[PDB]
Amino acid sequence: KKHTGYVGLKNQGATCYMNSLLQTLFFTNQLRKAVYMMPTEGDDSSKSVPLALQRVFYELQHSDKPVGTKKLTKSFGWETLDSFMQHDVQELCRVLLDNVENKMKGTCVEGTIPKLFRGKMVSYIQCKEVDYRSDRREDYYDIQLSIKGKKNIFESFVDYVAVEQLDGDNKYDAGEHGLQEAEKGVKFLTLPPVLHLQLMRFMIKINDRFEFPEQLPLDEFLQKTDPKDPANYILHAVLVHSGDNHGGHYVVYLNPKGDGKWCKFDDDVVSRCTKEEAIEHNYGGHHCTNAYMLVYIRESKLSEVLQAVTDHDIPQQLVERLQEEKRIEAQK
């Protein structure tokens, strides 16, 4: 008696935001395939994060039952009762991705992580009185957006690049010119194919209303724009939290194929839903249900990022290794 086309993950503790992120990464099809190509054949099943992530993805791809993640949590060492509460998604993500990005070094799939998530920035400082400016290019794999006092994602972005004033006791150490008054701000050089945006709702938990669109145009927050690739993004996933600070239930809504057809992933339960329930209903009310992380995929990168994944895309040597574990556990 089944349906959706997708299977869920099992509830095994206060993993909190974990399950949502796992589903989010699994449907980043280009990322999934790259993981399956990792040289884990010689790794230790209970100490290898790369191998643990492969296992979950394989399970999520084949299994007809909810998937477990115990070997995964043991993998990165987050096993204490509140180990996931004292961390945020932004940190979990760096754990997994940083581990996978490094394991792919020396392979045919090396650099898949940066290609998908890394973007370029530029932080500057300009002195008011004296002529001195300092430039520093930066790399980022995600964006933390201020939400308190903002209506939509557009104002958060307006505020993000806003010029900052450095004055008396804020005065900038200009070295040879001694302390000075100056401005500091940021400007975007590039925006990645997959955009990880975390909404700064936790600092407390801010449940004010905050709107985000299905289609997001960022072309204007970029230094130089370039036709043939307007920075227009398509909403892929909405990571939702319900309740107050330490009172919760985490869920995620995704339209996996980028076709506008959404589903709700509530741990082991996966069901179809409307756009409104995934988008508008999660803007925040005047009622605590809402989104804390959004995922957008560039309109021009949608096809490649959402590449169809086949059973053959998983190395036979991996397939067998995983399949044997199923037998060992079947004989239990």
Tell me how many domains the chain contains. Answer: 3
**Total H helices, total E strands in the chain:** 10, 14
Residue 273 among the catalytic residues: no
CA gap 25, 112 in Å, rounded: 13
DSSP secondary structure, 205-224, as one string: B-----B--SEEE-GGGBSS
Q: Which amino acid is at 230?
A: P
Domain check: are 147 and 292 in the same one? yes
Whether residue 3 is contained in a domain is answered as no
104 and 220 both lie in a single domain: no
Element (H, E) at 304: helix 302-305
Contacts of 49 by beta carbon, 8 Å cutoff, 6+ apart: 72, 75, 76, 95, 96, 99, 100, 103
Domain boundary among the residues 151, 174, 191 is at: 191
Judgement on whether residues 46 and 124 belong to the same structural domain of the protein: no
Tell me, yes or no, whether 244 and 154 share the same domain: yes
Residue 295 CA, distance from chain mean position:
6
Rounded Cα distance, 288 and 281, in Å: 11
Q: Please tell me whether residue 200 adopts helix, strand or coil conformation.
A: coil
Element at 327 (helix H, strand E): helix 316-330
Which method was it determined by? X-ray
Does 46 reside within a domain?
yes
310 Cβ partners below 8 Å, 6+ apart?
Answer: none
Pick the closest to residue 292 from 67, 16, 14, 10 (CA basis). Answer: 16
Candidate list 16, 93, 127, 263, residue with the active-site label? 16
DSSP alpha helices (H): ranges in 10-107? 18-26, 29-36, 49-62, 70-76, 89-103
Written as six digits, the tokens of 160 are 């993000």
C-alpha 129/C-alpha 127 separation (Å) is: 6
Declared resolution, Å: 2.3
Residue 162, token pair as written in the block = 């806003």
In angstroms, rounded to a whole number, what is the distance separating the alpha carbons of residues 221 and 197?
Answer: 15
**215 and 293 part of one domain:** yes
Does one domain contain both 148 and 280? Answer: yes
What sign has the CA pseudo-torsion 194, 317, 71, 100? negative
Please confirm, yes or no, whether 288 is among the known catalytic residues: no
Under DSSP, is residue 302 helix (H, G, I), strand (E, B) or coil? Answer: helix
Is 82 within a domain? yes
CA contacts within 13 A on the Cβ side of 273: 22
For the stretch 287-315, what's the b/e string if a residue is b when 16 or more beta carbons lie within 10 angstroms of its beta carbon?
eebbbbbbbbbbbbbbeebbeebeeeebb
Asked if 123 and 202 sit in the same domain, the reply is no
Q: What element of type H or E holds 236?
A: strand 232-242
Evaluate whether residue 2 is within a structural domain.
Answer: no
Rounded to whole angstroms, the Cα distance separating 103 from 77 reads 18
- How many CB atoms within 10 Å of residue 196? 26
Radius of gyration of the chain (CA): 22
* Catalytic residue from among 177, 196, 241, 249: 249
The total number of residues written for the chain in this structure: 332
- 249, 251, 225, 221: which is closest to 238 by C-alpha? 251
Residue 311 Cα to chain centre, angstroms? 25
Longest dimension (CA), the chain: 77
Report how far residue 105's alpha carbon sits from residue 120's, in angstroms, rounded to the nearest whole number: 21
- Element holding 291 (H helix, E strand): strand 289-298
Q: How far is CA 206 from CA 86, 196, 263, 287, 293, in A?
A: 18, 20, 25, 11, 13
Angstrom distance (rounded) from CA 42 to CA 301: 34
One domain, residues 258 and 320: no
Do 94 and 123 sit in the same domain of this protein?
A: no
Q: Which domain holds residue 178?
A: 119-140+161-191
Instruction: Read off the tokens for 195.
Output: 């955009």
Neighbours of 41 (CB within 10 A): 10
Residue 183: inside a domain: yes
For the chain, the residues before each gap (C–N > 2.5 Å) are: 203, 286
What token pair was written down for 308?
Answer: 């169809």
Contact 172, 127 (CB under 8 A): yes
Determine the angle formed by the axes of helices 49-62 and 18-26, rounding to 10 degrees. 70
Instruction: Give the Å distances, CA to CA, from 44 to 39, 40, 102, 103.
Output: 12, 8, 16, 14
Give Cα separations from 254 to 61, 113, 164 (angstroms): 16, 21, 36
